[model samples]
Target: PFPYEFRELNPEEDKLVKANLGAFPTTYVKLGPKGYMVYRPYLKDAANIYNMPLRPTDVFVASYQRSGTTMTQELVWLIENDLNFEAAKTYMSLRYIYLDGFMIYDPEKQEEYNDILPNPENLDMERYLGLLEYSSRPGSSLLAAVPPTEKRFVKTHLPLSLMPPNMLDTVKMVYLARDPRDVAVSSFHHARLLYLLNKQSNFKDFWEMFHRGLYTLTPYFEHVKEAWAKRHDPNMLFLFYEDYLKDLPGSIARIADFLGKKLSEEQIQRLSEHLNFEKFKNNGAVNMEDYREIGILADGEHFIRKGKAGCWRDYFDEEMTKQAEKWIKDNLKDTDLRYPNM
Candidate 1:
């Protein structure tokens, strides 16, 4: 028994989204208290996700998509691995697994893991077959199949209430909170890159979809509060995208401490430099240039955009910014939470 319920979105809601979503899951399923949408077919993985095993050394970065998930992941991974800069050169997706990614399968289109493996030829036969062996078990995440090297890094965009009830008790997790306005701007381009959103839709239409809870992580404030409620727990670290932007070294120190790892001054300086905006953009491992080379980003769109704290100002006009302010004021009131460093 999970705390949340899952229900198929009605035709009215689907009709509103069908044209805009292009092909990926317009008919969505609503989950949790805020009742956010995930692709309708991913419904199968809900129970599986809620029941997945967790370990004390297992680490996770949980947040709404595009909330600096990949960026935070690289810093955390490098920190945990004794700052193994060379080893990190390998693509992150292969090592830091996504719990919800298995749900990315589309029964109709017969496509699975397109986001993970854009070009299979890039992966050698030995590595490819081993991963195939992992997939043989239904709902098999590498957390169980592959031997974890002391610590395992797992990723998900699911809010805490929807995660395994035992997660807080089992693992130390980081939740990166971003200003939702920036999320809209970032996701508009991201969804276009993935074909999750219709390429033709304007920003206004996307904003309308977001406000109506048509997007999966809608009622964004509720998602923030889910982690906000557990901020005091020893095993949880609530971080802000803004804080990392404002003070990368300080934020890295805090995260390193939370993970029970200490960084020497030299390590901190180097890691901070490593995660710098321009450096991150050039970092082959996390930049996702491979997706463009393979035509996933067919127009050669940059996946890693301006990693600035408040780039949302460039995208929102008067009506949009006003709507965001009102929304932020309303939802932020009920919780004793502020975006870190705000």
Candidate 2:
């Protein structure tokens, strides 16, 4: 267990959110030395998340939410699994077990997460090493749900401090970060899909919490700094959304080289086209449109939005932009991190 204080948002802050985002399904907690914000329900396995076993073959894709995590996941999975695009048709969410992302449940209302909870009916091992066979929550560490394999794909939004202490030594990792301004606008929509925020929640209202670093998976810059310090590690690769956006092929090549996979010039070109924004958005498998039919995400809404960087221009006004710039400046002060588009 890591040293942490289980805490809640201040009353004024909590009240403001309830007014805008609706009551939290499960309250969010501020934990660890950085005051890492996360679903209080996550405190269950997160208590021993550091004790979760790590394997040499594990490939971790870590990032702040909506920071091009899925894009990287699609790229990394194709390279590591030998480009089985047919097998890739399975919903991307089902492709890998997210270490810290989905381990959640309310003891008082376990039935709400039954779809993700392990049950006898879904006990049969199936695709992606039984990962599709009911994963994520069970009032247990979802890490234990993983069956053995030659390669394991794990994703998390947790900062390194919350991870298994020696994860860098025992596993390979890729950390993707984006301009915080872009991530703020993008994550607001994602929060709606996950029901963490009300669909009617205005981006302006969300921005209030975001700029204050009050949202879950926050204190955004700290999460990046944790990895930035380790960017040069042999097993860790740090990337930016802007970098890949500017040169998708080069980015793909770098990721392939990092994973020890060699993609022919032909393979790289085709894979790059396959990841084109319009194509990726329509690709039901990677888009998680499955969430809509199940009513998790609103009908006709999308989890993947305008993939272009700097789209925050559409969402941020003069005052919001001023505040965001200040926040970024304050947080990035001592770090060498620099986003290309910023």
Candidate 3:
């Protein structure tokens, strides 16, 4: 089977991811010369995003997977909307809609595709048509979807090169990154919870896939490097997750400044507490715990895993750390990117 069906593809995705654990981009879909398997739909979506018009007020939140994407989106919405909690929670639905075309696939549509591709490796394209449902939504275009009066904040996981060119010219872009080692640990749990991998897979195997950039999206190092290279661009503001962990208020202030929005010291304190991991984890609005009720997530697994830095030490042994360090150094050589050693 050349282009495999959805379920059939998962096992291969697992094997490929397991084989490349700790290596970024260990598996790619080759959509346009290349991309990760799960994200190939974005290649087409990227074109649509590019052609979609833009406005001055449009803001883009871009990140590598499991990085601080969710937190940053919440923070930006809070800052722009004058700290409205209800609105911030609603914006979470908008977050993945733009990035993945659709969030939570339609059950009926899922059944439709499953019936068409009853054979594991069916040749019909209908099996994959479900991936296109997101882009098919009304007002999928950035301009049409985001209201003109509303200060727009949307999240994207696509790399800079794949993003719409006009997005750079017409909108503000905020990018967040985390330490690759911690990203690895978080991503491993995420895959298991999401059923992307068997729950039995060990951290060592996960580390191998991560080191090679095989798990999701592209290489974590490369994703950061592209953004780092563009750090000087006037429209772009890049922040590190570790900095936010270290100084919540300071980070909020920086985000405020970057967005050209001002916040009083008192307001910053309010937001710092509201946006804290403890508050966020419990808040049903954005916690995304409903994924479990919907049966997408395994019981007890959550989208909001631990929100801290240097947690990689909990999983990596001495040899693992040394190997990870070499991968980081080799990939990040001569670049300004450096992760603090734990």
CA lDDT scores, all candidates in order: 0.75, 0.77, 0.66
Q: Over the stretch 1-342, how does candidate 2's per-residue lDDT look in tens digits?
A: 456776778888687667555544456778877888787768777667767777788898999988989999999999998988998888776777777655443556444433432242443223322332343453225556667654678878888988767679989899999998889888877776655666566898888888676787788888889999999998999999888889999999999999899899999998899899999999998887655544344444478878888888899889998988888888868777787887
Q: Compared with the true structure, what per-residue lDDT tens digits does model 1 show for residues 197-220?
A: 655677778877776678866667
Query: How does each model score on TM-score?
Result: 0.87, 0.88, 0.79
Candidate 3: where are CA atoms >4 Å away? 1-15, 18-28, 31-38, 89-91, 95-97, 101-143, 340-342
lDDT for position 338 in model 2: 82
In TM-score terms, candidate 1 sits at 0.87
Candidate 1 — which pairs collide?
none
lDDT of 3 by residue, 1-342 (tens): 113222123564557564533122212342322333343334434455545667788888888878888888888888878887666666376543455534223333444433322143433344245334643453346447656776666777766755565466788888988888888888778766755554456889878766765555666676787787887888889888888888889989988998888899999999989887888888777787654443345555678878878878889999999998888778877777776443
Which lDDT value does model 3 have at 333?
A: 75
